[PDB]
Amino acid sequence: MGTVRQTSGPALARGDKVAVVSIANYTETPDAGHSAESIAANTLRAGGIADVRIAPAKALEWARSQNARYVLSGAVEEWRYKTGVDGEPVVGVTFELIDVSNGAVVWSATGTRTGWSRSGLSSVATSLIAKVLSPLQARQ
Amino acid sequence: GTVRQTSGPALARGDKVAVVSIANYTETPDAGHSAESIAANTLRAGGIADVRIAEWARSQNARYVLSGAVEEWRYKTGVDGEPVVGVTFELIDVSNGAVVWSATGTRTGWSRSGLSSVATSLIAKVLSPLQA
Amino acid sequence: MGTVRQTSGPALARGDKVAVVSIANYTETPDAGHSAESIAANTLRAGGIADVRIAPAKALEWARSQNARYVLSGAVEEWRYKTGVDGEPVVGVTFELIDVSNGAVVWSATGTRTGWSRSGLSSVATSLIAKVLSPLQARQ
Amino acid sequence: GTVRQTSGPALARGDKVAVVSIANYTETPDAGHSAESIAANTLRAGGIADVRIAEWARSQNARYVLSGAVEEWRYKTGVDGEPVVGVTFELIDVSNGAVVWSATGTRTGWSRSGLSSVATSLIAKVLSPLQA
Amino acid sequence: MGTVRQTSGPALARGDKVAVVSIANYTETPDAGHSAESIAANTLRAGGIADVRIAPAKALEWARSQNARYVLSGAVEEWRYKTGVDGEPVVGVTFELIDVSNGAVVWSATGTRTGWSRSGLSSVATSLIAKVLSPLQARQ
Amino acid sequence: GTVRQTSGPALARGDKVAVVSIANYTETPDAGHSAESIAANTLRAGGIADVRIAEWARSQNARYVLSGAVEEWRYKTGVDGEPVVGVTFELIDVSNGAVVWSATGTRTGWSRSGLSSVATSLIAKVLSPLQA
Amino acid sequence: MGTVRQTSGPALARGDKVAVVSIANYTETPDAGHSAESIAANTLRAGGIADVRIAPAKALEWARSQNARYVLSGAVEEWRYKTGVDGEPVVGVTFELIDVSNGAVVWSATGTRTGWSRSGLSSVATSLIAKVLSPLQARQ
Amino acid sequence: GTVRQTSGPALARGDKVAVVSIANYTETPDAGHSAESIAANTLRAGGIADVRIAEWARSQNARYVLSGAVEEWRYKTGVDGEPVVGVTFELIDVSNGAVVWSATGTRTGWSRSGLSSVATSLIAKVLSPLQA
Amino acid sequence: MGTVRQTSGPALARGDKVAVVSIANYTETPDAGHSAESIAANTLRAGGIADVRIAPAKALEWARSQNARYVLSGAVEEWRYKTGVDGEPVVGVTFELIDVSNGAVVWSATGTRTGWSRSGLSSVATSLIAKVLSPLQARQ
Amino acid sequence: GTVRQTSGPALARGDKVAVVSIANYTETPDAGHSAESIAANTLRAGGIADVRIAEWARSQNARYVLSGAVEEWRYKTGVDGEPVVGVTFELIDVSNGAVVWSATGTRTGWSRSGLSSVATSLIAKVLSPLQA
Amino acid sequence: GTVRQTSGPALARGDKVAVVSIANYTETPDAGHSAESIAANTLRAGGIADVRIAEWARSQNARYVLSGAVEEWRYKTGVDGEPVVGVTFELIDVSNGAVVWSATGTRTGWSRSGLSSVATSLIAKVLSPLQA
Amino acid sequence: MGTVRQTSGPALARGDKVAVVSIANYTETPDAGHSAESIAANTLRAGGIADVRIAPAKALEWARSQNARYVLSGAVEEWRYKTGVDGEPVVGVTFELIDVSNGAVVWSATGTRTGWSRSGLSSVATSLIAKVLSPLQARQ
């Protein structure tokens, strides 16, 4: 259950360097944004993007120093199990891809998903972040 | 629930819109910031090419500011509690400072629905008149 | 369920400027008055009133500076879910329209409503505030 | 419950009435202020053209002051707890300072009734003799 | 349920001024004595006693200054809902009428009442205080 | 429960009786003061024309002092807990200082009985020998 | 339920003055000893003992000053409702009568009683203290 | 439970016995003092004419001292918890200081039994050899 | 239920003086060791040992001053009701008899016992301590 | 759940790998250190002869660094709560500093499964491409 | 559960053994001291004539030291929780300082079994090779 | 239930001295690592390794001073009962054998096990640690 909404974006190159930078945490799950960061970064690598790097603890101040072409950022709106025994997992994420040249959001997505009650939070998140980030798969 | 939208301008893809401080009148922390992030993306998905999230709007060359407030953003109490969202929006012409467009939307979802889904879906419908 | 009681009032103009000013909160729901403020303001716009503005954090000191013709104020007497699982939402509001020239209450209303237990608080409130504020719809 | 009203003056639409400090003898915060707001509106709806909410009454040129106290204003305990309101009112001639009219009303509502409804409905009936 | 016990008393005049003065609160219901004060005062007016006044926050020091002929005082022994869901309301009151000339209790009453479980505390109290205070109705 | 009264004087309507400090040996606050107020009224209803509520008794010209203590004054625990009262009284000749009359009464009521009723009813029976 | 055990004692006179002095409280019921004091004193009067007096807050220092012939003292070992809803009342008392001349215990008793669950603590106590103190009834 | 008594002296009615400090090894406050009071009375009822409750014994001219300790003195847990008592006693010749008599007794009662009853009954049986 | 394990020991004399000295408390029952001390001492007397004395609050420093021939010591490993309503009592004790001449453990025992759920802790303890200490019965 | 691995180098038994600081993004204390210990052993079992657990890697002559983060490591709530693990890994060439290999794995186990088992089993599968 | 014992010396009745500090790795206070006391007695019952409970061992002329640790010593949770014991022992030659004998034993008992029984019984079996 | 995974290792000698050194505790069971230490040490002795010693409260600084040839270390990842009544015991351990000459891990193992709900934690642990450590049994 849930939906995914994507704007169009550029076809990314295998050699386009991407900085994953502070994914905001708007939930009461500690480190939820950090989990999304890790999950996102590996999604971006699995999608064929050779050089992907997560920022440390504007932000473009940094990404240029790492000679990144783009910055992937976002926020997590929901990341938890619903309350009670057999509460299903629920994830909600937004993502922005930023062109480091001008600071302009060239691609954006929103995805939410409510899981099976016999599913893990990490599983749903991981699946959703992969579907949401699929247009950032490297072009053939 | 419901959605009510007033008349408003026909938006162009090159019209710069700046999303600014969506108030949280709920007990869910960061409800407003979540509403900002979803709104910005809704606008971009609606074809507004340049949307930024924060007077300030002028220095960012924005034509319009999108603002508003969240009135409800939560699961109802108990297990199987259903997600409830309530939001108001206002679209502001930056040159004169006037509300040119405003809207209000509420929604209650199924028991097995995510709150983030309801909110995202609702915010999409409410802001649907700001696409082109 | 519930009732709405309205005094007569003037037929408002599309170009009558209205200031929405501090709606008292007499409930234990934080920001309940602020929610009513936002809801009310958009109701007033949806009703055809072009220039509607909510005051910041007598009060007529301000409304004249904004050249407002009227001030809509009120209070919230109830704004909550009844207690327990499946507690129905309940709203209770009063509203006064003030002529900024003389300070006189020219129109007033009281509305209460108990919702469906499968309804949101925000939904009931929004519906009730719209019915209550309907005589402030702009004249044709 | 019940309502008992004493005799009182025939009120005129131009008689200025000032609602003043309705005591809260309940554990529901702002019960009295809620009773003030509902009363004022009841009076206006009853045709009193000028009703204001706060010696002081003289400086506001009021003929009468409406006052009173709330004795009960709550849901009964437990889920399905029924709303209970109890109120006393007194109408005061400002020139001499005498109670010219007084009334007492209590009411218990259905389980599925709002407290704000009961109170509003009750306060309407109690103050019904102050209309014209 | 409950009983009312009354001594004889004088037949009060419509123009006999009465001061309602500090009704003691012997319960754990806050303001219970104040509620009885308000309820009592209006009962006394409804009973045909023209000038009735409640004292502010012996006491005869005051009542003479207000030229009162009598003082109605008392205490509340019980004023609550019995414990638990559907606990019936229970009221218990005593009342003394004092002649301001000499300080002598010329009339006295005790009333208790246990209510219907679907009844309000305020309703039972109000009814009981009216029955208890009925001999202080003004003579024809 | 029960009531036991010793012999005592035949009281006259003009005999001034002063009720003085009825001890509270319960966990119900003001139990004793409630017992004082009910006692005073019982005495007046019993035809004692002058009863006052506080050595001191002499300065008030009282012939007798009524005193005592409350041993139980509560609802039994749980819902449907029944009201339980237990009281002792002593009547004192003020001139010599001797107990001339004394009595003890206990009572348990129905589940649907008020505590104030039980106490009032019990205190009436116990003090019934002090009427005339 | 329960038992009463009594030693023999003197036949007391109607004019034998008795001081009731500090009945120890060995329970977790506050004022339990004081209740027994009051109950005992009236039992002693009801039993035909004309002058009976309870001491204020050895002890024979006092009783001689009041010209008492005897002192009735004791302790309360149990005075409570058993735990839970419908817990029966339980009383346990010991009593000593002291000759003020020599300080010697001339009469002593122990009584315990478990009540009906629909009985009051005060009722059981009162009944038990009366049975226990019955040999101190005045001789004919 | 059980009772075990050792041999001991034949007590005379004129033998002065002084009850001294019965230790409380329970969580029931004053268990030992309750055991002292019950013991003293048991001894008197058993025909010992002079029994007093507190080296010291010599200055009171006592022949014997009765002492001991309480090991259990409580209701078992839960509603319907049964009362449990456990006590040890020792009888001491004051001249030489030797235990001349000692005894141990435990008892569990019915659910509907008072703790004070069990203890009193048990303490009676245990000390029964000190009567004459 | 439970077992008792005893080493052989000497046949004790009726006139062998025994000091019962600090029985360790290894449970969360306060005074458990003290209870065992009292119980043990009387067991030793009931077993025919004329002079038995419990120490106040090595230890042989004391026992020699009392001219004791032996010291009985030990520890309590368990002394409680099992958890919950109708939790059976459980006792666990070890005992050492010490020759005051040389300090050598000449006799030792371990006993545990789980009681009937309708039994007292004090009863089980008392029974077990008596069985465990039975070889210290005086020889005929 | 699932496992996704990117391409990576063919590892040799003599390639020194150093496991370094696996972040804990869970509320289970030491989740990351547990993940480090299991990973190191998985690598050794996979035939990497020299694996050490902590710039630093250079001074230890390591060719590769294995790192990552734990996103979930817990039993689901309630009794019969099922164990849930979620992990990301990255393999880093020490000379240039580049990720040459990366992987993500999640897993939910039976109710009667140990958490340590799930994690160990999952971490084995995820790192299976780093064996030779 | 189980018991595993290594080989060890044949003990003589005159071999002095000193029990020394048995570690408590449980949340049951004094578990180790309880294990010391039971062990000492087991050894004595096994025919070791001189067993003492505390380098030090030399000054006490002991040949061997018995030591160890408790890993579990508790009732399982809930009512009817079964008692669980787990212990390790080591026997040490004092002259050289070497472990000459070591053993490990665990045991779970019936619901209606005492913890002290399980432990005592288990410790008996584990140490059974140190008898003669 | 559970698994055991072992790398190959050397065939250890009966006279190869082994130091058991700080087994990390990654659980919320206090002393879990210490229990594993004790259990492991005796497993190593039972496996035929004559001289086995546990370290006190790199670490190779110590093992050389004790002339140890190897160090057995590890960590405990899980050591507890699952939550609730009848929660089964669960153990999870890793182990490293270190050559004291060079500091190199020459043998390593991971073992987890979920027990029977009518089993003790100590029993499962003990069994698992013995299976896991079986290749460190001394060669014939």
Side-chain angles (χ1 to χ4, degrees), chain B residues 1-3 5-51 53-54 56-62 64-65:
Chain B
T2 59
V3 165
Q5 283 123 341
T6 70
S7 288
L11 288 217
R13 300 199 276 202
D15 297 342
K16 307 183 175 196
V17 175
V19 179
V20 190
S21 64
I22 295 200
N24 181 1
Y25 297 146
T26 76
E27 268 155 326
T28 299
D30 290 323
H33 298 127
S34 291
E36 279 156 11
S37 294
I38 290 151
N41 281 22
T42 301
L43 292 185
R44 294 178 191 117
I48 311 304
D50 196 348
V51 172
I53 301 187
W56 175 81
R58 305 186 201 281
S59 71
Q60 241 62 34
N61 297 311
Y64 298 116
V65 159

Side-chain angles (χ1 to χ4, degrees), chain D residues 47-51 53-54 56-62:
Chain D
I48 311 304
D50 196 348
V51 172
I53 301 187
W56 175 81
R58 305 186 201 281
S59 71
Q60 241 62 34
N61 297 311

